Amino acid sequence: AKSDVKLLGAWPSPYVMRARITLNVKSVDYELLEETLGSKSDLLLKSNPVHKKIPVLIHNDKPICESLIIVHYIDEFWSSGPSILPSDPYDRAIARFWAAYLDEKWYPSLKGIASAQGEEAKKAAVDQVGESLALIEDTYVKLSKGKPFFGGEKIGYLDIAFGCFLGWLRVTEKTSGVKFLNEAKTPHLAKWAVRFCADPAVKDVMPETEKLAEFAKLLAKF
Amino acid sequence: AKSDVKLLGAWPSPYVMRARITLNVKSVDYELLEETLGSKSDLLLKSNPVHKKIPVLIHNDKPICESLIIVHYIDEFWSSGPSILPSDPYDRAIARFWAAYLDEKWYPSLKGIASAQGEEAKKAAVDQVGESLALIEDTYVKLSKGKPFFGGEKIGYLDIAFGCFLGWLRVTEKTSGVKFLNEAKTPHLAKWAVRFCADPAVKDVMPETEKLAEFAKLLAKF
Ligand SMILES: CCCCCCSC[C@H](NC(=O)CC[C@H]([NH3+])C(=O)O)C(=O)NCC(=O)O
Ligand SMILES: CCCCCCSC[C@H](NC(=O)CC[C@H]([NH3+])C(=O)O)C(=O)NCC(=O)O
CATH class of the missing domain: 1.20.1050.10 (Glutathione S-transferase Yfyf (Class Pi); Chain A, domain 2)
Known part of the structure; x- marks a missing residue:
């Protein structure tokens, strides 16, 4: 839902597209926070300090990084x-x-x-x-x-x-x-x-x- | 068995060691077939034609490649x-x-x-x-x-x-x-x-x- 789920993304990114498609399949509403070329959002720096890459899924304030790890998580969490x-x-x-x-x-x-x-x-x-x-x-x-x-x-x-x-x-x-x-x-x-x-x-x-x-x-x- | 589970490996490989440890944790008996430097066994060539890398897990004549995928497979198959x-x-x-x-x-x-x-x-x-x-x-x-x-x-x-x-x-x-x-x-x-x-x-x-x-x-x- 818009509350509990945020996606840190950028519309041209194939990796981010993996996460959005998977959330759609699950009928998971979410908030999409878009990054800009040449800078990093404070929330990205906070959520993915290791890689500072998108996508990042933030679920009840807990970040998940790496697109395929994120696809797995959405599938294992919304397992119904x-x-x-x-x-x-x-x-x-x-x-x-x-x-x-x-x-x-x-x-x-x-x-x-x-x-x-x-x-x-x-x-x-x-x-x-x-x-x-x-x-x-x-x-x-x-x-x-x-x-x-x-x-x-x-x-x-x-x-x-x-x-x-x-x-x-x-x-x-x-x-x-x-x-x-x-x-x-x-x-x-x-x-x-x-x-x-x-x-x-x-x-x-x-x-x-x-x-x-x-x-x-x-x-x-x- | 030593029949139904084969592991194509090599003792110095840390990636092969991943598979061996996981098998031991599940108490799964297996046959270990060792590659040698400078060659590829025929069985490796037919089992991992894409990468020609070890480890390869062969379960009931079915090949599973890539060490962390193998670990997932073992954990998911032997799920008891x-x-x-x-x-x-x-x-x-x-x-x-x-x-x-x-x-x-x-x-x-x-x-x-x-x-x-x-x-x-x-x-x-x-x-x-x-x-x-x-x-x-x-x-x-x-x-x-x-x-x-x-x-x-x-x-x-x-x-x-x-x-x-x-x-x-x-x-x-x-x-x-x-x-x-x-x-x-x-x-x-x-x-x-x-x-x-x-x-x-x-x-x-x-x-x-x-x-x-x-x-x-x-x-x-x-
Ligand atoms: C730029 C859009 C088109 C180019 C293709 C890459 S998509 C976006 C790119 N994302 C990644 O590289 C992360 C990949 C990561 N390994 C994953 O699979 O999740 C990025 O900008 N990550 C932030 C970074 O690279 O620092
Ligand atoms: C040799 C010990 C040093 C550690 C690095 C190489 S270990 C053996 C090496 N294995 C791999 O590269 C496996 C990579 C694969 N991503 C996996 O995780 O299983 C291999 O295939 N070797 C044969 C080949 O690549 O041709």
Whole structure:
């Protein structure tokens, strides 16, 4: 509710988008406190002294940091709402694994596109994203088993872990002039991304690619 | 059994030690298959094709990769045994956060001492480990609340997440000549470490410092 739950956030952040989507799924009302480029709110400094990063969930004045730890907490606390993590332990392990792979391997390689110097090191980095996308496409096929989401009939953990990145992937496409996810290259993921973005829990916190692209260059600021 | 549970590991690995300790806590018997430097077993290649890393837990021919995911899996599957994660959602979010801290910041920072070239960029790195350790000492105090472990009366998630590194910490002290965890700089951690290494789930899978230091030598395949 607006009282007991605050989210420290910033609308362009994929990591923060993970928390908002998960709160929506649970039908948890909350207060959204937005950070600004170039400064830190006193409440952030207080709540996340170790990392000073967003998102931070503040529940009855108790802070929870790190997006995936926050998703887990919302799922373990509001455990009577719709399940975010899969029911079965083995399936939970698979889902955690692929979320960890996205933060460790995939998203860093996405950013390494806007970071490569030379038209060789760029194309090499493009090949790495495409390849990891093929892994992700196959994973979705094996996990979803004909159902709309990674988590089956309903958006789950992995949906949220990967889906949060859709805005920045679409931005990365336009600026690199490379399409990564579409009907032709990744037919299952393309169908999945349509469902995910139109889901009610997602629809209103997933930013238009147009806005996000412009903030992307507002972040042209060394 | 020694049949139904296989662990692909290697005795010098602190990440493998995580899985071994958790299995012992649950009293789960398992087969231990050891990797060797410069090779990958066929069974590892088919079980962790994405990362080709150990540990890998194979449960009834089903592979689970990544040490903290493995620990979660063991705690969630053998859910009638002694609990590894805390019971409370908030405490569990805090125990996850510090384990995540250790793998993101502390441990690479520990390794960045050995890899530091130039007497003083080394000093910078040495100060980073001591800063990090003061944080963990204070965290141990606030979290144990006078109990012997991070986990209370019994060893817990965070005990395992951190203590798995004790052997390599010692090696790092030996080689760098610096004293990091001890009665003067980290009094509580110093007593805890002795308690931890004494635990039955721990004492047989934690390698002797000198043995480990010699393997660190053999780790001269450049
Ligand atoms: C900036 C928006 C777009 C760039 C992508 C990063 S999103 C926001 C970013 N958040 C983080 O890096 C925290 C990640 C954290 N490991 C988590 O998963 O929760 C941030 O600004 N954290 C504060 C900081 O980096 O200091
Ligand atoms: C060797 C002891 C020094 C400690 C660092 C490396 S331990 C062994 C190393 N394991 C990992 O990197 C596991 C990382 C994984 N995140 C996990 O937590 O399990 C490995 O796979 N080794 C084989 C490989 O990476 O190819």
